[PDB]
Amino acid sequence: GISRDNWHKRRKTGGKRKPYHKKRKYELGRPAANTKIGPRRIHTVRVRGGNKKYRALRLDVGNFSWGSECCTRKTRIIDVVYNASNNELVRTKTLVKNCIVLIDSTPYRQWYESHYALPLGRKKGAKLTPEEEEILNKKRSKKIQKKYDERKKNAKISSLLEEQFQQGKLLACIASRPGQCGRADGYVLEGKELEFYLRKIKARKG
Amino acid sequence: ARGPKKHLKRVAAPKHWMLDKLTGVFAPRPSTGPHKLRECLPLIIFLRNRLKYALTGDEVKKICMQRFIKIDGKVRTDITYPAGFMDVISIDKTGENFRLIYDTKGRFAVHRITPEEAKYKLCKVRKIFVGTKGIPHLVTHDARTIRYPDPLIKVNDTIQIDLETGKITDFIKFDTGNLCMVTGGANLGRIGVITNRERHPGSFDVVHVKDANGNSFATRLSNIFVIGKGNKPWISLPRGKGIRLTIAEERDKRLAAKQSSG
Amino acid sequence: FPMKQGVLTHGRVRLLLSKGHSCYRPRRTGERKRKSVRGCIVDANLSVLNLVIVKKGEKDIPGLTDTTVPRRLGPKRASRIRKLFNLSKEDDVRQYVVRKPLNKEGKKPRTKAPKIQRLVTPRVLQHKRRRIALKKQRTKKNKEEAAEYAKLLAKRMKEAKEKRQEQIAKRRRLSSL
Amino acid sequence: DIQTERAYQKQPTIFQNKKRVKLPRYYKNIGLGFKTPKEAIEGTYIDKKCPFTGNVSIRGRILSGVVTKMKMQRTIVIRRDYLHYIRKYNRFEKRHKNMSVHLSPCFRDVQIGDIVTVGECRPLSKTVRFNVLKVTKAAGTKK
RNA sequence: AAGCGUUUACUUUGAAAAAAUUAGAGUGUUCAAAGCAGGCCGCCUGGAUACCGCAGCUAGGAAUAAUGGAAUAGGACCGCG
RNA sequence: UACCUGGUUGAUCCUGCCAGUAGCAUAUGCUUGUCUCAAAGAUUAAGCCAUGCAUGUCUAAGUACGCACGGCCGGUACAGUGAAACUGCGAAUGGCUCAUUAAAUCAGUUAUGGUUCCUUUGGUCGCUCGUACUUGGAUAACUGUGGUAAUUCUAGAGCUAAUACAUGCCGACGGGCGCUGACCCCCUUCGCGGGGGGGAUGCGUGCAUUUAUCAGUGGUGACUCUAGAUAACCUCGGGCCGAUCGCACGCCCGGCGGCGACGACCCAUUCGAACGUCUGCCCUAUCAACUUUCGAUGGUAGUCGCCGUGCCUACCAUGGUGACCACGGGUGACGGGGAAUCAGGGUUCGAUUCCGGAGAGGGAGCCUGAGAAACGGCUACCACAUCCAAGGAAGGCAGCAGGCG
RNA sequence: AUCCGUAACUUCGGGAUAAGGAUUGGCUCUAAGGGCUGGCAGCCGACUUAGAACUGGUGCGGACCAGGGGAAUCCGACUGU
Ligand SMILES: [Mg+2]
Ligand SMILES: [Mg+2]
Ligand SMILES: [Mg+2]
Ligand SMILES: [Mg+2]
Ligand SMILES: [Mg+2]
Ligand SMILES: [Mg+2]
Ligand SMILES: [Mg+2]
Ligand SMILES: [Mg+2]
Ligand SMILES: [Mg+2]
Ligand SMILES: [Mg+2]
Ligand SMILES: [Mg+2]
Ligand SMILES: [Mg+2]
Ligand SMILES: [Mg+2]
Ligand SMILES: [Mg+2]
Ligand SMILES: [Mg+2]
Ligand SMILES: [Mg+2]
Ligand SMILES: [Mg+2]
Ligand SMILES: [Mg+2]
Ligand SMILES: [Mg+2]
Ligand SMILES: [Mg+2]
Ligand SMILES: [Mg+2]
């Protein structure tokens, strides 16, 4: 098949290596996974040593970490915006490692409303009619209102992150190798990372 | 080759087994186990070629399948079981306990011990591993994974295990002045006190060991095994006592004893 | 050449066949081999058709429905014997197992019974007690060795604290000197 | 300065987006008595193939050569000289082997003809299996 | 006792160096080529050792051949603000 | 044993080659009484093969309703051998040959802190908090209808088991650990305030994988090492947490008991395998420049791989080797330990029983399996070749003997 | 038209578009090649070049435009008349 080998190509000086053996089973490559966004389709592949590798082919959710507070959530991936390797992987939505994806901000919003009891996103004018978030924000005890007030001192959020929570989509970088283990885990971008990737997205848009 | 090797040639056999050339093309390939290929000596060679109890390998198979041979506290029914250094082979009907100690040469020696000595043995640890819940582990030379050890036991130390329970009793720490069995190389079989330790970053460390008769020699630590504190061992010693006197002195001790015997 | 289910032709088709496929027996473990079969659509290009009567009609054919052929073997699994004889979970299977008579010339008439598989015996009950007794022994070994290492580590910590106090006292002696 | 590529160039070890009320730089000791430079700690560059601030370990051999080419980026070509002995003609001969060695950007004052110390590591590319550990400057050339 | 004291080439020791082969210890295969056996009224023993180019590691030496120091003094040293 | 002689001339002294002289192989001729060892289709054809054999295997301990034998103590299943067959393991070892191959293989030295690893051995295997006195239905061997000219070709109908394929719980297990925290209690203050406790309900709470954050039990010359704390994920083409088997047979007032064998997540050990670091290979210049967007030399980010790597992909830089012989070509070259001749130096050979590599007519691709790009495994094309009813089937002796050339 | 490749011979300029191959349509994108004002920001104007995907009955310089080629012999060098 498609072999991974050092003998099939030239030397350092420029001469050709002549074949002293044929292709082996350890000198083996396989076709690419190239997983998409959709309903989950993971195929197992037996590899060297009797082990398994999980080829993802369509994959929608991923366990994304918000590193400033150390709180990861399983979140649906809806769009791929930036990829440093190939812009064809941006055009055809393909998840590899170090992709920039857009994800739903609702689990991090629910965690922030449960922990710091402050509004997040929430364009001014709207109120919740099922009233459940209002119940979760209100109804505090006297001694635990002190604890939420001490949490409120360290509840400062960045402006670009706050605008992304207001829009509803967060930028996340893929950290796990998706065609190998089958998961599409990663981390939400913050700070200079977020400024760099938003500058690259703005330069691509124009 | 397309996989692992299963045969062993008689020419490709190691020299300390002292197998002869004319009888067979193949050598008994040892099975996998607690010891390496060229460090152990198989049960078929220990039973047939050294003790001369059995004539053929079929007779060796009959002896090991009557459940007579008891290697270090468990009956092994394989003729090619790797019996390496500090292994205790027990035979119940003859009442014979044997401890596989090297001779003064490179070969192993037929070394008779008491049952009180056969109840325990000594093993050098190789590394300390931290298990899945913060549990210290010793890795010995014969692959014995003993957990919850004494934290003073370090990388290059030896432990006096018990055969009936598989636990440690005492330990020798690798210090200067202690005894030294040399387990491998050109000085295989030497016994002497440790006089110097030379550390090396990257390259492997070396130890200068002084013999009881004053023959100092350097040896890398990978083939070094301490057997006790000071000049007092914790095991029994074969004749020769790990000296390696010169070939002229060996000729003298042969010829004078032969002329005295007559 | 035999036919094959699910090929959707009427001619002859050569196919790779492996373990778990029709019209092929694997000789080596995982052996694949080309075999030549026919399409499943029934046409005049056939020697044999196999027919299985599902519903019995009005008339009685003397070749098939008249000659009644019994089972060759009887149920061996105890759960299948319970399903056959409508048995409960506590009643006996040993009395209601089906045994076969054997008779021929020269030999005496015999009656041979099958070995009932998956029957709850005191040997299986002893093994079931045995592995949980081994679980008990492992947990007791863990508790005793953990307590022994706790006492040993407490002793090592006390001696290390004594050594640290001796070192700090030596530092105080050097500072006073 | 830095981060002139497509992806965000960063050190994978340290986390740099923590809650505030200078980036914490990761470095390590290399071993074998080699002193780490001051610029590898002070500066704001990164390099994943640096033996001080990267994911590579020095193992086995520690060799030396002389620098003859600095046209490649983040790596240099060195030249080793040795005298091979033929047993028939009891003489020597000059043979050279020019290996490609990854040059970490902590060593900035690097010219040609400098006696450089290299160390064996994992293969970072097709021909590079060596990192630069310390750079001795050539004889003279103090200006 | 541990660590650092221009770098080598050169010389010596030690380790690591598969066995089979070469030199060679012992041994009446009736001798020898061979083999690792064998010998005594159960015991006594041997199955060594030398060499293994070249390259790599290590510790002594600094005679010989390279290699630099300080010369717009961006030099060491003992101290200071 | 560091060795010479004849031949140019009418005769002499030199250079100079030829011829003798003596070994090791290869063949051949003549002759041959004894005995111990002993190479042996390598040189040309890694050319083609008739025939027969070379990898199969059962223990008290995975399945026994084939009377194929066989015991009488039976009715509380199976006494005991055992054809065949399912399941597991081996078949990736050994043997043959040197075709290809010139920093390649291979030899010495190294590391995997850059990776896998069946078996064996030593560790783990009630750590998880939510019908078990044992769950489901197919199937081979057995019976019965056959198709073809023909295969180690197989189908349909009946049946019947698993340590084959799946599902899945009782127990440990009564309580702890982090968070939610209704609410309650105590002191002080005019009072908001401030300090210290207890606490219903619910959520998660074992090892393995993945991702992110914090601190720094045991180590290394050196980790982004092992371990610890938090947050979650958890692949339906699902990571383990026994729905196994055999021998002696006891104790307690139905429940507890041994010696083992077998099945496996993970960590070591062993057998290894594979990539790498440095050094080393015959002749040729009538081979002086070679490689290079069809990877050539590096960087960044990925795919894939067991892992490190232009191995591959996208974008960049124009780099890399060479008169110290690169590149190209030839080899009547597998490399080495080694063999012969030998003063001291060398020269020639090494296909050949030991180690490593490559291959099964020539390439290419894949299933199974820990391990193969395996050929006494398949799948296609080319060369060679068998039977045929002309629709079709079957092959790989550079294995052991042997046949042709 | 674009990308390869191009021999004998020679006056070294040529032969040469030698010879011999591949691609060409539509649609939807990506990248690269710039000015004015106050390594950065804002505002604007141009045609090209390269690459990818999808798709049509393999059809695509779809009409038009638009070299058949190679090896030799004789004569005249040639451009020209
Ligand atoms: Mg083989
Ligand atoms: Mg010489
Ligand atoms: Mg040798
Ligand atoms: Mg003349
Ligand atoms: Mg004459
Ligand atoms: Mg001659
Ligand atoms: Mg006679
Ligand atoms: Mg005779
Ligand atoms: Mg031949
Ligand atoms: Mg040949
Ligand atoms: Mg050739
Ligand atoms: Mg050849
Ligand atoms: Mg050879
Ligand atoms: Mg092969
Ligand atoms: Mg052939
Ligand atoms: Mg093959
Ligand atoms: Mg064959
Ligand atoms: Mg074979
Ligand atoms: Mg022409
Ligand atoms: Mg003419
Ligand atoms: Mg004219």
mmCIF file of N, CA and C (backbone and C1' of nucleotides) in Angstrom, chain C residues 12 14 23 27 29-30 32 35 71-72 74 76-77 79 83 89 100 104 107-108 114-115 118 123 128 130-131 135, chain F residues 65 67 69-70 77 126 131 133 135 137 142 152-155 159 161-162 242 246 258-259 367 378 391-393:
data_model
loop_
_atom_site.group_PDB
_atom_site.id
_atom_site.type_symbol
_atom_site.label_atom_id
_atom_site.label_comp_id
_atom_site.label_asym_id
_atom_site.label_seq_id
_atom_site.Cartn_x
_atom_site.Cartn_y
_atom_site.Cartn_z
ATOM 1 N N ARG C 12 -23.541 -15.796 -14.109
ATOM 2 C CA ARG C 12 -22.542 -16.343 -13.204
ATOM 3 C C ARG C 12 -21.602 -15.247 -12.715
ATOM 4 N N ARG C 14 -18.320 -14.294 -10.060
ATOM 5 C CA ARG C 14 -17.194 -14.697 -9.228
ATOM 6 C C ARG C 14 -17.019 -13.686 -8.102
ATOM 7 N N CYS C 23 -21.506 -20.644 0.722
ATOM 8 C CA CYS C 23 -20.840 -21.394 -0.350
ATOM 9 C C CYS C 23 -19.321 -21.415 -0.220
ATOM 10 N N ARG C 27 -10.361 -22.728 5.214
ATOM 11 C CA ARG C 27 -9.458 -23.789 5.650
ATOM 12 C C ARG C 27 -8.441 -23.259 6.650
ATOM 13 N N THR C 29 -7.118 -19.980 9.002
ATOM 14 C CA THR C 29 -7.861 -19.015 9.800
ATOM 15 C C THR C 29 -7.855 -17.654 9.115
ATOM 16 N N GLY C 30 -9.020 -17.240 8.621
ATOM 17 C CA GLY C 30 -9.132 -15.987 7.902
ATOM 18 C C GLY C 30 -8.815 -16.068 6.426
ATOM 19 N N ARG C 32 -9.352 -16.161 2.471
ATOM 20 C CA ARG C 32 -10.258 -15.634 1.463
ATOM 21 C C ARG C 32 -9.929 -16.277 0.121
ATOM 22 N N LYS C 35 -14.741 -17.652 -5.390
ATOM 23 C CA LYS C 35 -15.646 -18.744 -5.716
ATOM 24 C C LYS C 35 -16.689 -18.254 -6.707
ATOM 25 N N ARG C 71 -37.065 -36.215 15.406
ATOM 26 C CA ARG C 71 -35.804 -35.540 15.698
ATOM 27 C C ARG C 71 -34.653 -36.535 15.793
ATOM 28 N N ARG C 72 -33.449 -36.064 15.460
ATOM 29 C CA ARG C 72 -32.276 -36.924 15.560
ATOM 30 C C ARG C 72 -31.664 -36.858 16.955
ATOM 31 N N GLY C 74 -31.959 -34.860 21.046
ATOM 32 C CA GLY C 74 -32.833 -34.197 21.984
ATOM 33 C C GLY C 74 -32.144 -33.019 22.641
ATOM 34 N N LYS C 76 -30.150 -30.668 25.019
ATOM 35 C CA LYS C 76 -29.032 -30.892 25.929
ATOM 36 C C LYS C 76 -28.915 -29.802 26.987
ATOM 37 N N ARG C 77 -29.150 -28.547 26.609
ATOM 38 C CA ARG C 77 -29.120 -27.451 27.567
ATOM 39 C C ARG C 77 -30.332 -27.530 28.490
ATOM 40 N N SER C 79 -31.828 -25.163 30.122
ATOM 41 C CA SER C 79 -32.807 -24.120 29.830
ATOM 42 C C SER C 79 -33.670 -24.493 28.630
ATOM 43 N N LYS C 83 -37.641 -25.045 28.525
ATOM 44 C CA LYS C 83 -38.499 -24.443 27.509
ATOM 45 C C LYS C 83 -39.341 -25.498 26.798
ATOM 46 N N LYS C 89 -38.054 -22.691 37.541
ATOM 47 C CA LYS C 89 -36.634 -22.487 37.797
ATOM 48 C C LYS C 89 -36.133 -23.349 38.949
ATOM 49 N N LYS C 100 -32.153 -41.728 25.068
ATOM 50 C CA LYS C 100 -32.427 -42.427 23.815
ATOM 51 C C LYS C 100 -32.163 -43.922 23.967
ATOM 52 N N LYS C 104 -29.535 -53.217 18.837
ATOM 53 C CA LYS C 104 -29.079 -53.882 17.624
ATOM 54 C C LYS C 104 -28.699 -55.312 17.982
ATOM 55 N N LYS C 107 -25.409 -57.006 20.518
ATOM 56 C CA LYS C 107 -25.290 -56.217 21.734
ATOM 57 C C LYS C 107 -26.594 -56.221 22.524
ATOM 58 N N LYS C 108 -26.474 -55.900 23.808
ATOM 59 C CA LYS C 108 -27.621 -55.783 24.688
ATOM 60 C C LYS C 108 -28.339 -54.458 24.453
ATOM 61 N N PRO C 114 -27.815 -37.916 27.724
ATOM 62 C CA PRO C 114 -26.827 -36.861 27.481
ATOM 63 C C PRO C 114 -26.373 -36.188 28.764
ATOM 64 N N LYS C 115 -25.173 -35.614 28.699
ATOM 65 C CA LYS C 115 -24.668 -34.775 29.777
ATOM 66 C C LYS C 115 -25.357 -33.417 29.743
ATOM 67 N N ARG C 118 -24.886 -26.549 31.639
ATOM 68 C CA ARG C 118 -25.379 -25.377 32.376
ATOM 69 C C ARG C 118 -26.400 -25.756 33.446
ATOM 70 N N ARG C 123 -20.461 -28.278 42.557
ATOM 71 C CA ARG C 123 -19.111 -27.934 42.115
ATOM 72 C C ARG C 123 -19.044 -26.498 41.599
ATOM 73 N N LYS C 128 -18.065 -20.744 42.744
ATOM 74 C CA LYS C 128 -18.646 -19.423 42.964
ATOM 75 C C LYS C 128 -18.321 -18.905 44.360
ATOM 76 N N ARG C 130 -15.590 -19.893 45.789
ATOM 77 C CA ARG C 130 -14.134 -19.869 45.805
ATOM 78 C C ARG C 130 -13.587 -18.541 45.300
ATOM 79 N N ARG C 131 -14.171 -17.996 44.228
ATOM 80 C CA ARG C 131 -13.585 -16.760 43.704
ATOM 81 C C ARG C 131 -13.917 -15.561 44.592
ATOM 82 N N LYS C 135 -11.437 -13.087 46.587
ATOM 83 C CA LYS C 135 -11.639 -11.643 46.731
ATOM 84 C C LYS C 135 -11.463 -11.198 48.183
ATOM 85 P P C F 65 -23.144 -36.696 25.899
ATOM 86 O "O5'" C F 65 -24.139 -37.421 24.890
ATOM 87 C "C5'" C F 65 -23.981 -38.796 24.571
ATOM 88 C "C4'" C F 65 -25.074 -39.267 23.646
ATOM 89 C "C3'" C F 65 -24.890 -38.919 22.175
ATOM 90 O "O3'" C F 65 -24.047 -39.832 21.496
ATOM 91 C "C1'" C F 65 -27.099 -38.379 22.863
ATOM 92 P P C F 67 -25.183 -43.361 19.165
ATOM 93 O "O5'" C F 67 -24.118 -44.513 19.448
ATOM 94 C "C5'" C F 67 -24.091 -45.702 18.668
ATOM 95 C "C4'" C F 67 -23.146 -46.719 19.258
ATOM 96 C "C3'" C F 67 -22.806 -47.911 18.379
ATOM 97 O "O3'" C F 67 -21.800 -47.620 17.428
ATOM 98 C "C1'" C F 67 -23.293 -48.641 20.587
ATOM 99 P P C F 69 -19.320 -51.856 17.143
ATOM 100 O "O5'" C F 69 -18.096 -52.089 18.135
ATOM 101 C "C5'" C F 69 -18.313 -52.362 19.511
ATOM 102 C "C4'" C F 69 -17.064 -52.137 20.327
ATOM 103 C "C3'" C F 69 -17.133 -52.596 21.775
ATOM 104 O "O3'" C F 69 -16.901 -53.986 21.923
ATOM 105 C "C1'" C F 69 -16.204 -50.419 21.680
ATOM 106 P P G F 70 -17.819 -54.863 22.908
ATOM 107 O "O5'" G F 70 -17.795 -54.065 24.289
ATOM 108 C "C5'" G F 70 -16.725 -54.235 25.207
ATOM 109 C "C4'" G F 70 -16.748 -53.191 26.298
ATOM 110 C "C3'" G F 70 -17.917 -53.249 27.271
ATOM 111 O "O3'" G F 70 -17.757 -54.230 28.282
ATOM 112 C "C1'" G F 70 -17.612 -51.026 26.552
ATOM 113 P P A F 77 -30.174 -40.045 36.964
ATOM 114 O "O5'" A F 77 -30.182 -39.350 35.531
ATOM 115 C "C5'" A F 77 -30.153 -37.935 35.418
ATOM 116 C "C4'" A F 77 -29.358 -37.474 34.220
ATOM 117 C "C3'" A F 77 -27.989 -38.116 34.042
ATOM 118 O "O3'" A F 77 -28.059 -39.348 33.343
ATOM 119 C "C1'" A F 77 -27.795 -35.762 33.863
ATOM 120 P P G F 126 -11.071 -8.527 42.740
ATOM 121 O "O5'" G F 126 -11.975 -7.443 43.475
ATOM 122 C "C5'" G F 126 -12.644 -7.767 44.689
ATOM 123 C "C4'" G F 126 -13.864 -6.909 44.902
ATOM 124 C "C3'" G F 126 -13.638 -5.655 45.742
ATOM 125 O "O3'" G F 126 -14.483 -4.610 45.268
ATOM 126 C "C1'" G F 126 -15.262 -7.019 46.780
ATOM 127 P P U F 131 -36.738 -11.286 36.120
ATOM 128 O "O5'" U F 131 -35.480 -11.966 36.824
ATOM 129 C "C5'" U F 131 -35.617 -12.636 38.068
ATOM 130 C "C4'" U F 131 -34.779 -13.889 38.120
ATOM 131 C "C3'" U F 131 -33.493 -13.805 38.931
ATOM 132 O "O3'" U F 131 -33.755 -13.974 40.323
ATOM 133 C "C1'" U F 131 -33.059 -14.829 36.827
ATOM 134 P P C F 133 -27.506 -16.867 43.526
ATOM 135 O "O5'" C F 133 -27.794 -18.387 43.146
ATOM 136 C "C5'" C F 133 -27.127 -19.001 42.047
ATOM 137 C "C4'" C F 133 -27.817 -20.259 41.569
ATOM 138 C "C3'" C F 133 -29.343 -20.197 41.461
ATOM 139 O "O3'" C F 133 -29.763 -20.929 40.310
ATOM 140 C "C1'" C F 133 -28.715 -21.986 42.875
ATOM 141 P P U F 135 -29.806 -20.331 33.156
ATOM 142 O "O5'" U F 135 -30.163 -19.090 32.226
ATOM 143 C "C5'" U F 135 -31.077 -18.092 32.655
ATOM 144 C "C4'" U F 135 -31.132 -16.947 31.677
ATOM 145 C "C3'" U F 135 -31.080 -17.333 30.208
ATOM 146 O "O3'" U F 135 -32.331 -17.750 29.696
ATOM 147 C "C1'" U F 135 -29.571 -15.556 30.611
ATOM 148 P P G F 137 -33.674 -19.299 23.233
ATOM 149 O "O5'" G F 137 -33.292 -19.245 21.689
ATOM 150 C "C5'" G F 137 -33.699 -18.157 20.862
ATOM 151 C "C4'" G F 137 -32.708 -17.873 19.752
ATOM 152 C "C3'" G F 137 -32.521 -18.997 18.733
ATOM 153 O "O3'" G F 137 -32.282 -18.439 17.437
ATOM 154 C "C1'" G F 137 -30.447 -18.502 19.752
ATOM 155 P P C F 142 -20.792 -36.581 9.711
ATOM 156 O "O5'" C F 142 -21.879 -37.029 10.788
ATOM 157 C "C5'" C F 142 -21.690 -38.169 11.619
ATOM 158 C "C4'" C F 142 -22.982 -38.563 12.292
ATOM 159 C "C3'" C F 142 -24.158 -38.768 11.348
ATOM 160 O "O3'" C F 142 -24.193 -40.065 10.779
ATOM 161 C "C1'" C F 142 -24.815 -37.314 13.092
ATOM 162 P P U F 152 -8.731 -32.864 -4.599
ATOM 163 O "O5'" U F 152 -8.911 -32.502 -3.057
ATOM 164 C "C5'" U F 152 -9.996 -33.031 -2.296
ATOM 165 C "C4'" U F 152 -10.452 -32.095 -1.197
ATOM 166 C "C3'" U F 152 -10.728 -30.648 -1.611
ATOM 167 O "O3'" U F 152 -11.837 -30.145 -0.867
ATOM 168 C "C1'" U F 152 -9.112 -30.683 0.110
ATOM 169 P P C F 153 -13.316 -30.141 -1.498
ATOM 170 O "O5'" C F 153 -13.184 -29.242 -2.806
ATOM 171 C "C5'" C F 153 -13.141 -27.826 -2.717
ATOM 172 C "C4'" C F 153 -14.190 -27.187 -3.591
ATOM 173 C "C3'" C F 153 -15.368 -26.562 -2.860
ATOM 174 O "O3'" C F 153 -15.080 -25.268 -2.358
ATOM 175 C "C1'" C F 153 -16.156 -27.879 -4.668
ATOM 176 P P U F 154 -15.711 -24.784 -0.963
ATOM 177 O "O5'" U F 154 -16.821 -25.880 -0.644
ATOM 178 C "C5'" U F 154 -17.986 -25.550 0.095
ATOM 179 C "C4'" U F 154 -19.234 -25.799 -0.713
ATOM 180 C "C3'" U F 154 -20.526 -25.929 0.075
ATOM 181 O "O3'" U F 154 -21.083 -24.677 0.436
ATOM 182 C "C1'" U F 154 -20.386 -27.676 -1.519
ATOM 183 P P A F 155 -22.087 -24.572 1.686
ATOM 184 O "O5'" A F 155 -23.528 -24.776 1.040
ATOM 185 C "C5'" A F 155 -24.004 -23.905 0.023
ATOM 186 C "C4'" A F 155 -25.331 -24.368 -0.518
ATOM 187 C "C3'" A F 155 -26.415 -24.612 0.520
ATOM 188 O "O3'" A F 155 -27.098 -23.417 0.859
ATOM 189 C "C1'" A F 155 -26.324 -26.433 -1.006
ATOM 190 P P C F 159 -35.879 -28.999 13.668
ATOM 191 O "O5'" C F 159 -34.353 -28.534 13.684
ATOM 192 C "C5'" C F 159 -33.561 -28.605 14.860
ATOM 193 C "C4'" C F 159 -33.172 -30.023 15.206
ATOM 194 C "C3'" C F 159 -32.294 -30.184 16.431
ATOM 195 O "O3'" C F 159 -33.021 -30.085 17.643
ATOM 196 C "C1'" C F 159 -31.477 -31.552 14.680
ATOM 197 P P A F 161 -28.707 -28.129 22.925
ATOM 198 O "O5'" A F 161 -27.157 -28.259 23.261
ATOM 199 C "C5'" A F 161 -26.402 -27.135 23.680
ATOM 200 C "C4'" A F 161 -24.983 -27.523 24.002
ATOM 201 C "C3'" A F 161 -23.986 -26.379 24.086
ATOM 202 O "O3'" A F 161 -24.010 -25.742 25.349
ATOM 203 C "C1'" A F 161 -23.079 -28.148 22.790
ATOM 204 P P A F 162 -23.789 -24.158 25.465
ATOM 205 O "O5'" A F 162 -22.213 -24.001 25.620
ATOM 206 C "C5'" A F 162 -21.503 -24.691 26.644
ATOM 207 C "C4'" A F 162 -20.024 -24.773 26.352
ATOM 208 C "C3'" A F 162 -19.255 -23.457 26.463
ATOM 209 O "O3'" A F 162 -17.943 -23.710 26.961
ATOM 210 C "C1'" A F 162 -19.080 -24.302 24.253
ATOM 211 P P G F 242 -16.538 -9.724 37.793
ATOM 212 O "O5'" G F 242 -16.095 -11.199 37.387
ATOM 213 C "C5'" G F 242 -15.219 -11.424 36.287
ATOM 214 C "C4'" G F 242 -15.653 -12.604 35.453
ATOM 215 C "C3'" G F 242 -16.695 -13.509 36.099
ATOM 216 O "O3'" G F 242 -17.533 -14.066 35.087
ATOM 217 C "C1'" G F 242 -14.696 -14.733 35.729
ATOM 218 P P G F 246 -16.099 -30.636 35.195
ATOM 219 O "O5'" G F 246 -14.746 -31.237 35.786
ATOM 220 C "C5'" G F 246 -13.911 -32.071 34.996
ATOM 221 C "C4'" G F 246 -12.582 -32.330 35.663
ATOM 222 C "C3'" G F 246 -12.639 -32.989 37.029
ATOM 223 O "O3'" G F 246 -12.813 -34.392 36.935
ATOM 224 C "C1'" G F 246 -11.063 -31.204 37.040
ATOM 225 P P G F 258 -10.406 -21.968 50.527
ATOM 226 O "O5'" G F 258 -9.258 -22.996 50.122
ATOM 227 C "C5'" G F 258 -8.258 -23.370 51.058
ATOM 228 C "C4'" G F 258 -7.656 -24.710 50.720
ATOM 229 C "C3'" G F 258 -6.862 -24.780 49.425
ATOM 230 O "O3'" G F 258 -5.537 -24.296 49.565
ATOM 231 C "C1'" G F 258 -8.331 -26.628 49.554
ATOM 232 P P C F 259 -4.783 -23.618 48.319
ATOM 233 O "O5'" C F 259 -4.398 -24.845 47.376
ATOM 234 C "C5'" C F 259 -3.479 -25.841 47.804
ATOM 235 C "C4'" C F 259 -3.419 -26.990 46.828
ATOM 236 C "C3'" C F 259 -3.081 -26.617 45.394
ATOM 237 O "O3'" C F 259 -1.695 -26.420 45.180
ATOM 238 C "C1'" C F 259 -4.942 -28.078 45.405
ATOM 239 P P C F 367 -5.526 -6.103 5.367
ATOM 240 O "O5'" C F 367 -6.280 -7.496 5.539
ATOM 241 C "C5'" C F 367 -7.669 -7.620 5.273
ATOM 242 C "C4'" C F 367 -8.130 -9.047 5.430
ATOM 243 C "C3'" C F 367 -7.853 -9.676 6.786
ATOM 244 O "O3'" C F 367 -8.833 -9.342 7.753
ATOM 245 C "C1'" C F 367 -7.180 -11.163 5.070
ATOM 246 P P C F 378 -2.970 -20.687 -1.181
ATOM 247 O "O5'" C F 378 -4.378 -19.979 -0.967
ATOM 248 C "C5'" C F 378 -4.973 -19.234 -2.012
ATOM 249 C "C4'" C F 378 -5.578 -17.946 -1.513
ATOM 250 C "C3'" C F 378 -5.890 -16.928 -2.593
ATOM 251 O "O3'" C F 378 -7.125 -17.186 -3.236
ATOM 252 C "C1'" C F 378 -4.783 -15.862 -0.781
ATOM 253 P P G F 391 -17.464 -22.614 -23.957
ATOM 254 O "O5'" G F 391 -18.695 -22.611 -22.945
ATOM 255 C "C5'" G F 391 -18.887 -21.519 -22.058
ATOM 256 C "C4'" G F 391 -19.600 -21.937 -20.797
ATOM 257 C "C3'" G F 391 -18.829 -21.749 -19.500
ATOM 258 O "O3'" G F 391 -18.837 -20.414 -19.024
ATOM 259 C "C1'" G F 391 -19.877 -23.880 -19.522
ATOM 260 P P G F 392 -17.555 -19.834 -18.246
ATOM 261 O "O5'" G F 392 -17.597 -20.572 -16.835
ATOM 262 C "C5'" G F 392 -16.411 -20.805 -16.091
ATOM 263 C "C4'" G F 392 -16.345 -22.231 -15.604
ATOM 264 C "C3'" G F 392 -15.182 -22.578 -14.688
ATOM 265 O "O3'" G F 392 -15.388 -22.188 -13.342
ATOM 266 C "C1'" G F 392 -15.353 -24.215 -16.369
ATOM 267 P P A F 393 -14.185 -21.538 -12.498
ATOM 268 O "O5'" A F 393 -13.274 -22.780 -12.091
ATOM 269 C "C5'" A F 393 -13.714 -23.715 -11.118
ATOM 270 C "C4'" A F 393 -12.840 -24.945 -11.088
ATOM 271 C "C3'" A F 393 -11.427 -24.762 -10.556
ATOM 272 O "O3'" A F 393 -11.360 -24.741 -9.140
ATOM 273 C "C1'" A F 393 -11.357 -26.022 -12.550
#
